[PDB]
Amino acid sequence: GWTFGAGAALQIPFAMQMAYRFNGIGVTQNVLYENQKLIANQFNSAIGK
Amino acid sequence: ICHDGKAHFPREGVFVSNGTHWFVTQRNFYEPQIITTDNTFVSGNCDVVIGIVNNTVYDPLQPE
């Protein structure tokens, strides 16, 4: 995540780190937790153009 | 977590367990607490999230 630049590295799964970041712009967490597949597909298609 | 056929998400913090019990704590310090309905909100049903577990959610007032 972002804890390796301010101390010691601490592990965390990816799908929860994305919710952590997603909470910082206004939208809540269930929006991400209910649309994981669509977001993964969009990201995968975006990187490749 | 999933209780009574519903999905409960945390308000501020994470879900942690010591092996046989579940708690709620802040993300930057270790201070365990018991799960009630005053620090979670419910949205949807129990078939959309991946990794849902089972437990019981304490109701603080009505059954007391």
Report d(CA A11, CA A28) in Å as an integer. Answer: 23
Report d(CA A15, CA A3) in Å as an integer. Answer: 16
- Closest among A33, A49, B40 to B56, alpha carbons compared: B40
- Resolution of the experimental model, in Å, one decimal: 3.3
* CB < 8 Å from B in window 1-49 of A: 15-16, 29-30, 33-34, 36
DSSP β-bridge partners for residue B36: B58
- Widest CA span in chain B: 34
User: A-chain residues within 8 Å CB-CB of B14?
Assistant: 16
B28, B50, B52, B53: best to mutate for the A interface, most A CBs within 10 A: B50
Whole-number Cα distances in Å, B41 to A5, A23, B36, B45, B63? 33, 15, 10, 12, 19
Residue A11: CB partners within 8 Å, gap ≥ 6?
Answer: none
SS (H, E, C) A7-49: CCCCCCCHHHHHHHHHCCCCCCCHHHHCCHHHHHHHHHHHCCC
User: CB pairs under 8 A, 24+ apart, for B8-13?
Assistant: B8/B40, B8/B41, B8/B42, B8/B57, B9/A29, B9/A30, B9/A33, B9/B40, B9/B41, B9/B42, B9/B43, B10/B39, B10/B40, B11/B39, B11/B40, B11/B41, B12/B39, B13/B39
Report d(CA B58, CA B8) in Å as an integer. Answer: 12
